[PDB]
């Protein structure tokens, strides 16, 4: 309810995660083995990590925050050791799920170079993909990813079995754009009578964050003049400061 009104994409998300852990009596009896892996991709400022810190709140089971910095140690065949132990403890536990982030570091593509200085990190990820799909050490553990470069990463990590589902957090639309303001605006002192259907119309294709900065900086320009309550213009005077005339369109 704090997310910025990307109302559909969550529904593809949670349907992976929690319903096969709360209401398996639907998926199983009808005859479907649910998926066990998602991927998230969208441009930045869009709330890929937001919806993922959320679901930990509504987990009803554990969660993991894998720090990608600990998988690239400077001793060979070590980081991979950390991968497999990451799962030996998981399936020990019941119904674990996992949140990677910025796997473009680790799940990069492959190549052959007699310098190949990324040689080692390739040997780590193979501790992963062999572990996700082969001879079923897996029970009920799910996976979660995140990116801003979904083209470069190797096909093997975006094959079904591994990733039975993926989601495009595209940009918002005007209607959904508004419900972002209604979240970030509640804590504020503002007059009753502004009309958001300008502010949305007047903020073209843009992201969750670049709105949150706008709701803010309408407030800051008050403080630059030592008023005590905002207006309708100061929002507009923020937009021209954030986004930042033309005659050949009028």
């Amino acid at each position: 309810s704090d997310v910025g009104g990307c109302k559909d994409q969550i529904e593809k998300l949670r349907e992976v995660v929690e319903l096969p852990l709360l209401s398996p009596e639907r998926f199983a009896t009808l005859g479907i083995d649910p998926p066990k892996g998602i991927l998230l991709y969208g441009p930045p400022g869009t709330g890929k990590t937001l919806c993922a810190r959320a679901v930990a709140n509504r987990t009803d089971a554990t969660f993991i925050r894998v720090i990608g910095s600990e998988l690239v140690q400077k001793y060979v065949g070590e980081g991979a050791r950390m991968v497999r132990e990451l799962f030996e403890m998981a399936r020990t536990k019941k119904a674990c799920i996992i949140f990677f982030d910025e796997i473009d570091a680790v799940g990069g593509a492959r190549f052959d170079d007699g310098a190949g200085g990324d040689n080692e990190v390739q040997r780590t990820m193979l501790e992963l993909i062999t572990q996700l799909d082969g001879f079923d050490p897996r029970g009920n553990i799910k996976v979660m990813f995140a990116t801003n470069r979904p083209n470069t990463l190797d096909p093997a990590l975006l094959r079904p079995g591994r990733i039975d589902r993926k989601v495009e957090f595209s940009l918002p639309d005007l209607e959904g754009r508004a419900n972002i303001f209604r979240i970030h605006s509640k804590s504020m002192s503002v007059e009753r009578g502004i009309r958001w259907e300008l502010i949305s119309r007047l903020c073209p294709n843009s992201t969750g964050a670049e709105l949150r900065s706008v709701c803010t900086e309408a407030g800051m320009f008050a403080i630059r003049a030592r008023r005590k309550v905002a207006t309708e213009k100061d929002f507009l005077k923020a937009v021209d400061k954030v986004i930042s005339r033309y005659m050949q369109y009028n």
Partner: protein, 72 residues
Amino acid sequence: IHSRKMTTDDDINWQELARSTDEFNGAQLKAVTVEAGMIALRNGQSSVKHEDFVEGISEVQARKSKSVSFYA
């Protein structure tokens, strides 16, 4: 094969779906299934249909958009 452990209407032409896919991997062809067996449930029904398989396929390649502009 993968549909054996499911319900399914007798309506469908499995060969047409083969014709509606080009350069797929068998793993995807499985995930085409569950995304149909799943989307049936989102629509709020129990058995499986033909078109429910279809919008699984468009759910794979991330078409993910009606894109209803100015055609027809």
